[PDB]
Amino acid sequence: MELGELLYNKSEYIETASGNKVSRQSVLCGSQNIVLNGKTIVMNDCIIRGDLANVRVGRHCVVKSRSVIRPPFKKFSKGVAFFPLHIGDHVFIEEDCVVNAAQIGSYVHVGKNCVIGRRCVLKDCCKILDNTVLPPETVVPPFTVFSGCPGLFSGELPECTQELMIDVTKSYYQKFLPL
Amino acid sequence: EKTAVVIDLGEAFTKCGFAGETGPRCIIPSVIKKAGMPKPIKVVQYNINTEELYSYLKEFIHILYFRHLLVNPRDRRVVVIESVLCPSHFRETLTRVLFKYFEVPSVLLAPSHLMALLTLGINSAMVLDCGYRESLVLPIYEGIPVLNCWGALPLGGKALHKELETQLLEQCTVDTGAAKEQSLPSVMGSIPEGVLEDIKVRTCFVSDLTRGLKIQAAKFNIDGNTERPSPPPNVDYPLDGEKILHVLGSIRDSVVEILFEQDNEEKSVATLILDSLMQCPIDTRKQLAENLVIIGGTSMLPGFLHRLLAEIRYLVEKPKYKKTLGTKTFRIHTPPAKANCVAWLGGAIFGALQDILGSRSVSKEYYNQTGRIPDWCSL
Amino acid sequence: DVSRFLRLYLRKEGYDFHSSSEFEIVKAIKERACYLSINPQKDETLETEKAQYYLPDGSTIEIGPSRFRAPELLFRPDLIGEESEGIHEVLVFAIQKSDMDLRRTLFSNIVLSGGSTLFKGFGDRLLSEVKKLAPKDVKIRISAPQERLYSTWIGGSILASLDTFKKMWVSKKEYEEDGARSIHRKTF
Amino acid sequence: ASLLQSERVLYLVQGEKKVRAPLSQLYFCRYCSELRSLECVSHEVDSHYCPSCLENMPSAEAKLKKNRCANCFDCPGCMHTLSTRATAYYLACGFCRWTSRDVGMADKSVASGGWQEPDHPHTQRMNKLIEYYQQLAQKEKVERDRKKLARRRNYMPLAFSQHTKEIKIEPAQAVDEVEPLPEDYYTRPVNLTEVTTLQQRLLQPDFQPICASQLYPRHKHLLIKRSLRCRQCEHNLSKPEFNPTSIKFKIQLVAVNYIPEVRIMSIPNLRYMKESQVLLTLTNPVENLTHVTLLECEEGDPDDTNSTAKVSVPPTELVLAGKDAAAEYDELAEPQDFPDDPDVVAFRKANKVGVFIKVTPQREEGDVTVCFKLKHDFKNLAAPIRPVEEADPGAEVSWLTQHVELSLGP
Amino acid sequence: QDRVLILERQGHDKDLQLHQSQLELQEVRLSYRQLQXXXXXXXXXXXX
Amino acid sequence: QDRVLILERQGHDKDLQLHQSQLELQEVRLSYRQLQXXXXXXXXXXXX
Ligand SMILES: Nc1ncnc2c1ncn2[C@@H]1O[C@H](COP(=O)(O)OP(=O)(O)O)[C@@H](O)[C@H]1O
Ligand SMILES: Nc1ncnc2c1ncn2[C@@H]1O[C@H](COP(=O)(O)OP(=O)(O)O)[C@@H](O)[C@H]1O
Ligand SMILES: [Zn+2]
Ligand SMILES: [Zn+2]
Ligand SMILES: [Zn+2]
């Protein structure tokens, strides 16, 4: 709201360990294969399944409530297996959002309730708008905005994304405290 | 020298590409998606303030020169195709945008009708331009446009889109998907122009003269009991997903008739050729009649060229045109590119001529000095 | 033709008058606001006021440069592309075609008639355009009446009143007996 | 950028055209002293690339290939990048289940090399017309040159010497009767799936087909890498030669990376009166600033103004430390403690200072808008200096006034 | 004399090219100084 | 013609200047490309 990030008070129940905060409400079925190296946030009722995964997330990663990050299955003639996805640094997944994406780049703002397709690659410094469908096996270049049910080039982003996005994710993390 | 770019700014669609090519590289709706506005504003709009028009054209030309075409604007020349009697302030603005902001080397303001003639190769021909706003005709005799014997009527895309909207609202039968299996009239107050255009293209067609003449008298109901031909089957068209509009068979073949209807005045798209040709010089009559050209996307409508050429030969026998244009052989030219992209193709053929282009075209150095674009009005 | 050419220039200003009814209001626009500039080239370079005209519906239209460069086509019909002499030319040519002795008296007595002389600054332009074509140091008097539009009728009204008119006209019985020529031969 | 509403508080540009834009979008010009907008600055073309298979193509190859990738294809039905599937290869879409088999294109033995677009039907007639007009234009050039050098000479067409292969195109034959509309169209159900919409018709302009079976898939459109160059200044910013899979700038320049960015941290009540807290972070390592000015009286386009923001505060010296600092590491005396300013200054963290503005809302009905001028000490470094060799006191002394327009939520 | 005028025009066009190249030299040379700084930064960052 | 001869000699000298300037620009561009290759190596290290 007018550049400034607003207050969000968390409850007592949340798994805070080595900077990484993960809501107890949010199930993450397969805790072994999933890994959170940095000071990540995972909001309540969110899913990070371990269906033969290697879900590596960023330094300041944010996943809002009711949102799912599942790896896609690669339809290979040699052997059909689930491809391990790698969420980049400073990644912001918005609320109620579906992600079946392989290799999500750093410094990205994925919009609200937007379905990303199977085996979908996202390069760094991009932005997917809200109520948008990226089809299976699609690529989005840097400094781009993809939107619509087709999921196609809408326009370009501001030049200063790399520097700006840092402030957003770090401010949200700092502003997001217990009550 | 570099291959000069060709742009053709229209109300419905803009043609864009490079000179010495078989057709245009990009053809897109002439609109811009501004932040806040739900429906995108139209880039060409006649009779508005210059500053507001300048901003829209600046926004549009930017999209053409970077997103659609990929080339530096300052490097290579421009060939701006625009119809004769295009509003003064609009053409003045369009040039001022290209010369000031983009800093183009030189613009050439070619009339669409003379460009359409080059594509065929014939030096003299009659040219009808059934566009979005107005269906204009202009006789071209051996390179010289005859402005004396001009002709225009508002029987294009806009007039056809409006006629379709009116007819659909009368016989309105939509299946919303909320106990609306039964015929529900006018659930939506207005239908968006994007939908109406898609219905027109896919569903509606141009009827034969014999069947059309019956349709005219049928809807009139001039002291006759159900004297209409059997219509085509009713086509169901989806509106915004769930809502399914059942388009009546009568609407498909009646909507077009407003173009070819006489309406007492004796002013149709057909009559406009013969009205112009009768006003032409006596020596030029037989050459122009033999060489007819039908450009514009409105004439793409299926079975338009057959109805027009037939309606011509019927209106010839009518006593007004029977004396002068009685024993004349009307033959249509088939241009190499499609009816929509005839105008553009001429500018590309002209753009390929680097030697003549530089001389005829207005240089930026001249415009910066003078600030006076040459027109067919007095200097 | 001036009304027809004004409609074309009004479309070049961006106001269409396609309908036959809408042609009548172009004739009204012409009759209301259209001034003949003494020098046409100077008024074109000068920025116009764009004088607003009110239509029957109530809508306003800014005419601008179309106002003055429409009736110019009388004095210079080659501009649009009509092969004619021009209003200044036909007057001079008609005098020059006549015998040399009368030329001076015919220049000294010119009368403007009809409605297409009532254009604002018509007499001013014609005088200037005639002078340069006509011989040097010749007196040119263009005597316009106040009732130019109704001049042709008033002439007939006077002619009709005279007792000489009784002889001039052709009787109904004369037309039945004499034949078709009767009307033509008595004309003069 | 979008999550936080950067499209609210805007900075003004100086020149011919005045524009209100977010600082995120604007660029600072270092050659001179005047920030300019994406609109004001001139655009260039650097490199072309495919959005699917990120391959940097040269400018020459693009002109030959008509600004398209040979390997990648976009579907005609919906607008999405196609994928090669095997059984011996067919082209299929993920969003819609349109195949290359549907339209009736035969499967190729080789993956990429086999696929092609048919030649344009009126390509042979085209070249013949160009060559005819080229020869005919060349005659006019010689005539115009001969006429011009005769005028330049001014010899009155003096005959010193004796004065004074042809290409003839056949003009297209006019058909007596054009083909009528087929009698099928009368008394036949029209399937809207079979016939194509305008959008997908017009994407293939060379021979836009009514039927779907004719409509072939066009090559994927190449995208552009923009480089900005100003009117007064020369260079400004640009991009690398490997913009594909890179977020690095060859020359990073932006208004947020020089001019101190203002943000509305707290928003108070909108009912006729309130006290709004706004932050003023610095980007430069060591500098000084001040938000003293009240935007004069009816000067610098204050038409948007619908309130009277006092901001009656003297300059406050803030500095940025490009390092990972702890929560209250050290307390500096002269910077922080000396100008305590409890009423004026809300809080002073690292590269951060909150300031209370006394706004007067409900002067109009709604949509509260405030105009205020912000000053800053711009270390321009216009003169030649290697790692701040020159003192740059006159540069630092220069006070640059940016007319800011903050828009409260209302 | 036509050859003289044409050769003068050729020299003038070459001088225009030279001036454009000089403007590009200045602008892209400030760019190259920035890139030199960037290359130093890149070596340091490679170490880091 | 003698004046034009002086102009033509100066034009040839300026063409030599153009050759030198273009050579310097191309060489600096090649050096920057090598630096960018080094940067790409650094980026590979960073990816690792
Ligand atoms: N391929 C087509 N088939 C049928 N109708 C078309 C086609 N292309 C365009 N049209 C219709 O005809 C019109 C043509 O307008 P156009 O000539 O492109 O614009 P302008 O006259 O402004 O230059 C469009 O508005 C559309 O309604
Ligand atoms: N006040 C006026 N100013 C300008 N033009 C006028 C004016 N009054 C009439 N006209 C023009 O002159 C025409 C009238 O011609 P008129 O004198 O009636 O011809 P006639 O002599 O054949 O009866 C009008 O139709 C109009 O075009
Ligand atoms: Zn500058
Ligand atoms: Zn590709
Ligand atoms: Zn598709």
Numbering used by the authors:
A (entry chain V): 1 to 179
B (entry chain J): 12 to 390
C (entry chain I): 189 to 376
D (entry chain Y): 2 to 88, 106 to 182, 219 to 464
E (entry chain x), F (entry chain X): 290 to 337
What does the article say, verbatim?
Dynactin is a 1.1 MDa complex that activates the molecular motor dynein for ultra‐processive transport along microtubules. Dynactin is built around an Arp1/actin filament, which is capped by pointed and barbed‐end complexes (Schafer et al, 1994; Eckley et al, 1999; Imai et al, 2014; Chowdhury et al, 2015; Urnavicius et al, 2015). Dynein binds dynactin in the presence of coiled‐coil cargo adaptors, such as BICD2, BICDR1, and Hook3 to form a highly processive motor complex (McKenney et al, 2014; Schlager et al, 2014a). The pointed end is important for binding dynein‐dynactin cargo adaptors (Zhang et al, 2011; Yeh et al, 2012; Urnavicius et al, 2015; Gama et al, 2017; Qiu et al, 2018; Urnavicius et al, 2018).
We performed signal subtraction on the TDR and TDH datasets individually to focus on the pointed end, which slightly improved the density around the cargo adaptor interaction sites compared with previous maps (Urnavicius et al, 2018). The majority of pointed end interactions cluster around four sites. Site 1 involves the disordered loop following the long helix in p62. It is shared by all three adaptors, with the loop appearing to adopt different conformations to bind each adaptor. BICDR1 contacts sites 2 and 4. In our TDR structure, we previously estimated the registry of the BICDR1 coiled coil using density for the sole tryptophan (Trp166) (Urnavicius et al, 2018). This positions a series of negatively charged glutamates near the first half of the loop in p62, suggesting an interaction between the cargo adaptor and site 1 at this point. Extending our registry suggests that the positively charged site 1 loop on the pointed end binds to a negatively charged patch on BICDR1. Further along the adaptor, our model positions the BICDR1 Spindly box near a prominent kink in the adaptor (Urnavicius et al, 2018) and close to site 4 on p25.
